[PDB]
Amino acid sequence: SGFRKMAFPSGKVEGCMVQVTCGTTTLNGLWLDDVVYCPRHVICTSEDMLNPNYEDLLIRKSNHNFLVQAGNVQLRVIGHSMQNCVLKLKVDTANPKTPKYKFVRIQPGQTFSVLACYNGSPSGVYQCAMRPNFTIKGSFLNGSCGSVGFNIDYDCVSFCYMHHMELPTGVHAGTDLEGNFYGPFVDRQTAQAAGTDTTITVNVLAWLYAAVINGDRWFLNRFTTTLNDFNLVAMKYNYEPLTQDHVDILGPLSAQTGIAVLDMCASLKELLQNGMNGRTILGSALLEDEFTPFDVVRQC
Amino acid sequence: SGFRKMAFPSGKVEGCMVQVTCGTTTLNGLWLDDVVYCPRHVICTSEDMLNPNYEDLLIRKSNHNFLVQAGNVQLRVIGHSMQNCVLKLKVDTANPKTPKYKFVRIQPGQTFSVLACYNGSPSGVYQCAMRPNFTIKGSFLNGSCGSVGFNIDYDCVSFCYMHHMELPTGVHAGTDLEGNFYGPFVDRQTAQAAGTDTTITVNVLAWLYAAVINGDRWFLNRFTTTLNDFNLVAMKYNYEPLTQDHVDILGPLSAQTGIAVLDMCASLKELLQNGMNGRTILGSALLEDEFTPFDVVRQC
Ligand SMILES: O=C(CS)N1c2ccccc2CCc2ccccc21
Numbered sequence: 001s002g003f004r005k006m007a008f009p010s011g012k013v014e015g016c017m018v019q020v021t022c023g024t025t026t027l028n029g030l031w032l033d034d035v036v037y038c039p040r041h042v043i044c045t046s047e048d049m050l051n052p053n054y055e056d057l058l059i060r061k062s063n064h065n066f067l068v069q070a071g072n073v074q075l076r077v078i079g080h081s082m083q084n085c086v087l088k089l090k091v092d093t094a095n096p097k098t099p100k101y102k103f104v105r106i107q108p109g110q111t112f113s114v115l116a117c118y119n120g121s122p123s124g125v126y127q128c129a130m131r132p133n134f135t136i137k138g139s140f141l142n143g144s145c146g147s148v149g150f151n152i153d154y155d156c157v158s159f160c161y162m163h164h165m166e167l168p169t170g171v172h173a174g175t176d177l178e179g180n181f182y183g184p185f186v187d188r189q190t191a192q193a194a195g196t197d198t199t200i201t202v203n204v205l206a207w208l209y210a211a212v213i214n215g216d217r218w219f220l221n222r223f224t225t226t227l228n229d230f231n232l233v234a235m236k237y238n239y240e241p242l243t244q245d246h247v248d249i250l251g252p253l254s255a256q257t258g259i260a261v262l263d264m265c266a267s268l269k270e271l272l273q274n275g276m277n278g279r280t281i282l283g284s285a286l287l288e289d290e291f292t293p294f295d296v297v298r299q300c
Numbered sequence: 301s302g303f304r305k306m307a308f309p310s311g312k313v314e315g316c317m318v319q320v321t322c323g324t325t326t327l328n329g330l331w332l333d334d335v336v337y338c339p340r341h342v343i344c345t346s347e348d349m350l351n352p353n354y355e356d357l358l359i360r361k362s363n364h365n366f367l368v369q370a371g372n373v374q375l376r377v378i379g380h381s382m383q384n385c386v387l388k389l390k391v392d393t394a395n396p397k398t399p400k401y402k403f404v405r406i407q408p409g410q411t412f413s414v415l416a417c418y419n420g421s422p423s424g425v426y427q428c429a430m431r432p433n434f435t436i437k438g439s440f441l442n443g444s445c446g447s448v449g450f451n452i453d454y455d456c457v458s459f460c461y462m463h464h465m466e467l468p469t470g471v472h473a474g475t476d477l478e479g480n481f482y483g484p485f486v487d488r489q490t491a492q493a494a495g496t497d498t499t500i501t502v503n504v505l506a507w508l509y510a511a512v513i514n515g516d517r518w519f520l521n522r523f524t525t526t527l528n529d530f531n532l533v534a535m536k537y538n539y540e541p542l543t544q545d546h547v548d549i550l551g552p553l554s555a556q557t558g559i560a561v562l563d564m565c566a567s568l569k570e571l572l573q574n575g576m577n578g579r580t581i582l583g584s585a586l587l588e589d590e591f592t593p594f595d596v597v598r599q600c
Pocket residue numbers: 025027041042044045046049141142143144145164165166187188189190
């Protein structure tokens with residue numbers, strides 16, 4: 001038993017991290033088959049980032065201006081192209097450590113593991129969630145750009161995230177592996193509004209089920225509620241509205257614990273209206289929303 | 301910026317995980333050079349675990365009773381011996397993926413990453429702390445025994461923990477890689493007292509420094525205190541006593557933030573006597589003690 005915020009084993013992704021240098025800018029890239037993926041602002045200086053014309057800046061670059069280094073060995077760049085906000089560097093050799101992989105664009109509320117890297121070397125791994133406003137609350141120092149987020153299904157790595165920038169508010173923004181940003185953001189050093197964030201209601205409920213499975217039951221109440229009554233409380237407390245799709249995804253957890261989804265919703269409503277009174281759930285003094293229903297089933 | 305509970309990249313350890321089966325019991329083992337390390341209770345049935353005589357049970361076993369499988373390939377066992385609570389199976393081949401490594405016995409309050417495994421396959425990685433009472437609050441299902449904890453220094457893996465059992469209280473206990481248990485525990489299915497746990501004071505302080513570095517400063521107070529006055533408050537709230545060794549280890553963080561250690565202690569004292577009033581520090585509604593001063597410096 002016990003419950004931890006677990007990340008996926010990162011070995012398959014560590015074998016794909018390289019260092020990409022263009023001019024005096026260096027960041028991380030993802031080497032899969034004979035292509036290296038990295039943020040396109042690798043071609044920018046700090047002054048460029050105030051208002052960059054990426055097409056004009058890329059046109060000044062040739063294949064030999066991109067230094068791609070995997071461990072101690074150098075890769076030969078035989079082609080380069082821009083796809084949305086990522087650079088795709090065609091190299092002469094296929095990464096012998098390429099895992100089976102897919103590129104996927106996740107939805108808000110879904111979770112993934114981040115391998116934080118610097119100069120192409122991994123430093124740590126952690127599990128996080130795509131916020132409903134399409135930011136992530138990561139740990140990204142300078143030079144961490146190009147670090148990637150992923151999920152693993154047995155032997156297949158689904159890459160879903162590449163880190164591009166930190167907003168003035170301290171949260172982080174990035175793209176899928178086709179270079180399309182999650183959210184309204186652009187790769188330019190200008191003030192950019194993230195929307196109102198909300199709590200991922202279905203994730204909180206999944207984690208309340210994880211708590212019951214692990215013995216924390218003090219929050220179980222004698223009440224029930226309706227989907228519409230609960231969503232009234234949800235909107236007040238800036239929780240995402242619960243849908244019947246969310247009720248269905250929680251089904252297996254409902255079956256395992258013997259607690260109806262709407263009964264668990266009534267417990268959550270009581271927790272939102274009355275707080276926790278200094279008590280804890282699974283060692284947390286607040287409601288956790290970084291576990292999906294799939295995460296809870298996988299761990300439990 | 302940002303701050304996450306990061307685990308070490310686990311790839312070097314994933315290459316060392318094998319499946320060990322003895323009779324009908326299967327768990328995880330650690331394959332380094334030509335030796336496989338695993339918990340000795342792999343030779344026990346559930347009924348054996350009530351009161352096992354390991355020497356007598358091991359004597360009934362021969363080299364060919366140990367099935368060691370690394371991925372799809374089988375290892376040939378050419379020797380077996382018991383060192384305290386671990387089994388050491390000498391196999392005919394050196395693990396070609398053996399990283400540079402050391403065996404270390406950590407101290408309470410220190411942290412490490414756990415690669416949770418089942419049937420020799422990794423499922424997740426997470427960062428945790430050795431509690432002052434020598435338990436760990438992990439996530440370990442049946443068959444997770446033999447999963448290991450570790451730290452990584454550049455290219456060197458310091459193995460410090462092997463999981464052996466879950467106590468009736470739901471916390472977990474294990475050994476170093478020489479087979480000596482952390483704590484008073486024994487590998488037998490009997491009720492065993494973990495002592496009073498305490499909060500790792502030096503870790504809380506390190507994480508308060510991480511908070512200041514990341515912009516959370518509301519808890520900074522106009523007070524200071526003394527080491528002895530603070531320890532008076534520490535004992536009341538079941539915090540470990542702060543020593544001058546702890547003050548020295550916090551030095552670099554004190555220098556970076558410009559906040560004296562004893563001033564930070566005064567802020568912590570105020571937090572212990574008055575609570576957080578529903579506010580948060582680095583997204584947590586309680587005081588975190590799973591980051592060492594070294595962890596904070598490494599991340600920041
Ligand atoms: O985040 C990173 C690097 S990881 N960069 C970004 C990204 C977005 C907005 C601004 C900046 C300023 C710093 C800078 C300079 C040169 C190349 C990239 C970056």
